[PDB]
Ligand binder design. Structure first.
Ligand code: COA
Length: 546
């Protein structure tokens, strides 16, 4: 009932972090060992002497020395019998209607071990990373729990594979987007199967690129392969039967990084003109809406779909513009929803890494996100709510915390700390926000913890205000119901009374200004001072090896 569990992962990735939260918070010890070398793996296992080894995320054989001596269970993102290193990629390229996940034993043949548990699910037409983070992750969690229960019994015998098949590593030629030959559906299937790695190769404006994060376009039309418009740095490209938006691209070179399309395409883009759509406009056709504002039951909902939850300096100002709009509206509550897969991961480290001066662009980014946080804070006459449908890390968590109420879906993983990015001091009014919820001592413990915590755990420690919902859709409905109830009550007006008296106080208003200028002073030293931890850690996060 207190098992010692060793994780063998290539990287401590989203699924590995979620499993670590699920097991740790059920009182098991989990040691995490990143795949460096087979000799080092046998070493780490021999010291730790686990009762059970889980491989949430592997790129290569586990040494037979380890799994013939410790029970080793492998995660595989395919249904029983599916073998190979790109299971999801193939499932999407082939158009599988039904898919699944398999927890199988380690064996001498790749993925040929007996099955300990599996789940199946219906497949959405969506990015590989979104399938992985939702259906695959929730399914994996169920298999691992059912496997830990069967391990306790010891009277469990796994099921050998029957029908099986092999899919090899998928080559670039198969993902290559050809605009004259590929319809919109085919472009989306190729980009979906390659998002977020390795990307679909293509040529745009005569430049060889990798495509990322596609969206169908039903109004704009033109010459296939012709760039039709810009819109918040995304480009819309003619296909064989219509058009598609591509928000992010990467030059096909060693040192190049994923960036918004306009930054990759650059001066190659001069003829093209913007085609704006404000978030509050209503639209009858499918197009790409980075930020979306809709009103339901006297409630203002701000969706913001920032790729990978990274918030560029410019995306912060686009968001602030929408919060200012929402604040002049006949609405009683304003709810920041983020996206389904991410609430926010703070500053965009890719646009920072790309800038002429990363220190300068860091200065811009932190002041832009602080401007968003200050605007939320300065809402005396409305209720402010953060709805975390997906994961959040670093500054993105503390953005959420400036809202009056913070809710999250079950299974959301949070990293409210800067231990991965050179120990930035942090801003986003955390010195005002965090103590008001957990106290200066526990808040420091939280920011000192480099391991993840669940949405469940954050509820306990008072970090957030409630956790519910299994899916993003479910969580959204629940959140709308709960907020509609509250503003349709007398409590809402008694809540606002206090908020109005305190928030328009010159005491409070200058208290938060001291906090901002305090955090920004610390962050300025991180950005510009002798210790360069931040820039070293950014370089490796942004350019990590796949
Ligand atoms: C939060 C975090 C621990 C989540 O870990 P994880 O579950 O393993 O998620 P990943 O690192 O795989 O994120 C997936 C993608 O989002 C990107 N991403 C996540 N946060 C990002 C950020 N702030 N800026 C730029 N890119 C980011 C990642 O590079 C990765 O890119 P890819 O899939 O295209 O290869 C981790 O992503 C992180 O530390 N992000 C940076 C947060 C930060 O330091 N912001 C600056 C201070 S506000």
């Amino acid at each position: 009932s207190h098992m010692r569990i060793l994780f063998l992962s290539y990287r401590f990735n989203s699924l590995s972090q979620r499993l670590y939260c699920e097991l740790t918070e059920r009182e098991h010890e989990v040691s995490v060992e990143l795949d460096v070398h087979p000799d080092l793996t046998v070493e780490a296992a021999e010291l730790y002497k686990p009762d059970l080894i889980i491989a949430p995320f592997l790129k290569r054989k586990i040494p037979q020395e380890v799994w013939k001596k410790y029970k080793t269970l492998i995660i595989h993102p395919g249904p029983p019998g599916d073998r190979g290193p790109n299971a999801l990629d193939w499932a999407i390229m082939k158009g599988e209607r039904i898919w699944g996940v398999t927890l199988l034993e380690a064996s001498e043949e790749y993925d040929a071990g007996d099955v300990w548990a599996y789940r199946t699910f219906p497949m959405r037409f969506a990015r590989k990373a979104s399938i992985y983070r939702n259906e695959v992750t929730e399914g994996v969690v169920e298999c691992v729990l059912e496997a830990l229960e069967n391990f306790e019994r010891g009277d469990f015998k796994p099921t050998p594979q029957k029908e099986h098949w092999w899919n090899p590593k998928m080559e670039q030629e198969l993902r290559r987007v050809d605009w004259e030959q590929d319809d919109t559906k085919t472009v989306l299937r190729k980009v979906y199967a390659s998002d977020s790695q390795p990307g679909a190769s293509s040529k745009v404006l005569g430049k060889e690129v990798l495509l990322f994060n596609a969206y169908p376009e039903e109004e704009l039309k033109g010459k296939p392969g012709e760039v039709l418009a810009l819109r918040d740095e995304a480009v819309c490209i003619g296909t064989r039967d219509g058009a598609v938006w591509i928000t992010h691209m990467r030059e096909r070179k060693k040192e190049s990084i994923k960036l918004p399309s306009a930054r990759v395409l650059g001066e190659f883009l001069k003829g093209v003109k913007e085609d704006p759509i404000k978030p509050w406009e209503k639209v009858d056709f499918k197009t790409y809406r980075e930020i979306l504002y809709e009103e339901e039951d006297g409630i203002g909902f701000i969706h913001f779909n920032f790729y990978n939850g990274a918030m560029s300096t410019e995306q912060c100002y686009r968001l602030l513009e929408t919060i200012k709009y929402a604040k002049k509206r006949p609405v009683k509550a304003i709810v920041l929803l983020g996206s389904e897969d991410f609430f926010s991961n703070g500053m965009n480290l890719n646009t920072i890494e790309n800038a002429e001066s990363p220190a300068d662009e860091s200065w811009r980014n932190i002041n832009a996100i602080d401007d968003v946080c200050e605007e939320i804070l300065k809402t005396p006459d409305k209720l402010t709510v953060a709805g975390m449908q997906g994961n959040a890390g670093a500054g993105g968590v503390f953005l959420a915390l400036t809202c009056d109420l913070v809710f999250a879906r079950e299974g959301v993983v949070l990293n409210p700390h800067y231990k991965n990015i050179g120990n930035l001091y942090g801003s986003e009014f955390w010195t005002y926000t965090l103590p008001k919820r957990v106290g200066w001592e526990k808040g420091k413990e939280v920011m000192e913890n480099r391991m993840p915590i669940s949405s469940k755990k954050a509820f306990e420690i008072g970090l957030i205000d409630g956790v519910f919902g299994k899916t993003p859709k479910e969580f959204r409905q629940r959140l709308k119901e709960r907020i509609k109830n509250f503003i349709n009550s007398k409590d809402f007006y008694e809540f606002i009374e206090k908020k109005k008296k305190e928030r328009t106080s010159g005491e409070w208003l200058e208290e938060i200004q001291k906090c901002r200028e305090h955090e920004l002073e610390k962050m300025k030293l991180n950005f510009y001072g002798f210790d360069t931890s931040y820039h070293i850690a950014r370089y490796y996060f942004v350019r990590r090896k796949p």
